[PDB]
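Minutes, project huddle
Topic: does the predicted pose make sense with manganese (II) ion bound?
PN asked that the exact inputs be recorded in the minutes so nobody has to dig through chat later. Recorded below.
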Amino acid sequence: EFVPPPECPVFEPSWEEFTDPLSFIGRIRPLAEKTGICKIRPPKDWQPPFACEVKSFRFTPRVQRLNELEAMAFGFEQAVREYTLQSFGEMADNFKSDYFNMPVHMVPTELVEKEFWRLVSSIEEDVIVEYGADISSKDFGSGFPVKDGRRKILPEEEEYALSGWNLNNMPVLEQSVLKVPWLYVGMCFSSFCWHIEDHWSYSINYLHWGEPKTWYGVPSHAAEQLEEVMRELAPELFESQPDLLHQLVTIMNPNVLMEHGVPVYRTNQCAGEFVVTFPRAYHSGFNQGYNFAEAVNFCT
Ligand SMILES: Cn1cc(Nc2cnccc2C(=O)O)c2cccnc21
Ligand SMILES: [Mn+2]
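Predicted holo structure (tokens), as shared on screen:
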């Protein structure tokens, strides 16, 4: 069965260290850049409200067939449904509780992880899920409060609208001679395959609420090694594809990378926790259940 990779670093900054995100990320860099990803738990009393327009939040998630690569009237597999945040959560909880035959919060994270990777390589069982991925924060607002006048800000919420850890306040303009956060409404087994960011950018990721998001990360010093293992084992039909396109279907069991000498670290990002990916740190993951994440690429 699946062997969980070693855990990535988790930092619990004090209020003093939590003052400046870029300063903190710069200070943890000697360790975190050697693991590719890391997790940051804010101080206990740092609890931003959820600021999306929930009444009007509507979206059509994308269908994900977990074993599509292994499986190589097709094209009309599933029927698309539009959801609200509530109706998607109802669907997501019903799927998970039916699949595991237990209440959603009782399913061990290790079991969802083991079952996810079994399903990815299974030819005898076709599991299909839906992912509300890459919803722009312009559509229904950011999950963080933003002082743009579109939604009321309470006095006790203003500090979060001005916080440097508010993803809308991360720097995004790269220096050159010559960008807003994105939202992810997850369900059990919804996933993102191995990739790096455009321009080898850092990314920061915040789980607003819900069940955890499970991550895998590879340090940048092993980026070429991972790409080598990909070219060896990825389908021949997608081998010659440019990286930007190949990254749409670069799903690979972490144990396969580990067996080929590639260092891989994991974490369960829980509600209220940040995940930072360092430059050229390949990462991939899946959601344990119904959750809501916000992410943005930033520069230092
Ligand atoms: C472009 N894009 C980004 C996705 N998701 C992530 C990317 N990087 C880090 C985290 C995530 C996440 O899903 O939490 C994604 C999932 C499905 C299709 N397209 C996607
Ligand atoms: Mn990413």
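Observations noted during the meeting:
- Residues 195, 197, 203, 283 surround manganese (II) ion (ligand 2) (CB under 6 Å).
- The chain is about 25% helix and 25% strand.
No decisions taken; revisit at the next huddle.
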